[PDB]
Ligand binder design. Structure first.
Ligand code: GOJ
Ligand code: GOJ
Lengths: 169, 169
């Protein structure tokens, strides 16, 4: 009982771009937005998220730990101290711990990208929220409704349990 | 009429790893394997593909253009001249053309990855065929059967039309 549509960038036969469909999904949020993302520097999508939070929507954002400073650098340039917005919680996720042949311990990355709105609709795919995905790259997403959404909801809760408050904060 | 299962790396509550499930799909192929991948340096998955082609399976591989020589280097260090395997065709795909800040002409990346076998089963997700995805990163894939598979078959044809013979050849 799952329906899935595809969208591409650059766009193919469909009316809206991937970025226009992201904005739509955020503006249609009534209760909760859950986002997992590797790099987030797109100002227009950030402005939609902040506008949702001001109307009372709870916003939970999980960013790859190694790329977090790109997000922070964006929010400060826009004159926003994001840590002051009580309806938004931003936390970081690490990849696996591993040991290099020089013996230093490192961690890798969270390679996972999805937007989950009101525990009811998902956009999943290879599009990251940065300028290079508008101008440079080819990407694709699924728009998902029905039973599969429940599995994205479980996985979000599992990453949220693992996630940490960012060290800058 | 689409069925979907999720798998994770590191693994969760499923018996097989992502890499074991990829090997299974390739071993189960009877007629054709279609792969789109950004970076391909895993020697064990390469060996399964070559074995399939020796069985008479037709193999079509689409690789991101910028990363192609990492693939070719791996096949050469394995003692294989991949150019001579008639049942495999390897071609490259480029992202969009664009102008940088300084006015230089560059192209972006194909950010797409999926495995399509016998026009009937797809593995789609964030796992790339390289060492870092086994040891360092968190990733996820979907295993897809039913009507949505037709949409992946159409997109593979469209990307195969766009694709080029690699410049390195
Ligand atoms: C972190 C609190 O939020 C959740 O766990 C969530 C949000 N939507 N579905 C699950
Ligand atoms: C001739 C290139 O191969 C395809 O178009 C294909 C393979 N499986 N589905 C479509």
């Amino acid at each position: 009982g799952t329906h899935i549509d595809l969208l591409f960038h650059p766009p193919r036969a469909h009316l809206l771009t991937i970025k226009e469909t992201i904005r739509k999904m955020i503006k249609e949020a009534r209760k909760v937005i859950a986002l997992v993302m590797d790099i987030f520097t797109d100002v227009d999508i950030f402005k939609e998220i902040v506008e949702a939070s001001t109307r009372g929507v709870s916003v939970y954002i999980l960013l790859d730990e190694s790329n977090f400073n790109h997000f922070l650098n964006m929010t400060e340039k826009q004159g926003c101290s994001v840590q002051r917005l009580r309806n938004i919680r931003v936390r970081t996720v690490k990849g696996q711990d591993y040991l290099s042949k020089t013996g230093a311990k490192f961690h890798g990355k969270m390679e996972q990208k999805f937007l989950l709105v009101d525990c009811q609709k998902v956009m999943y795919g290879s599009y990251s929220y940065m300028w290079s995905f508008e101008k440079a790259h080819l990407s694709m997403v699924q728009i998902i409704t029905g039973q599969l959404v429940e599995s994205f909801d479980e996985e979000f809760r599992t990453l949220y349990a693992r996630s940490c408050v960012p060290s800058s904060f």
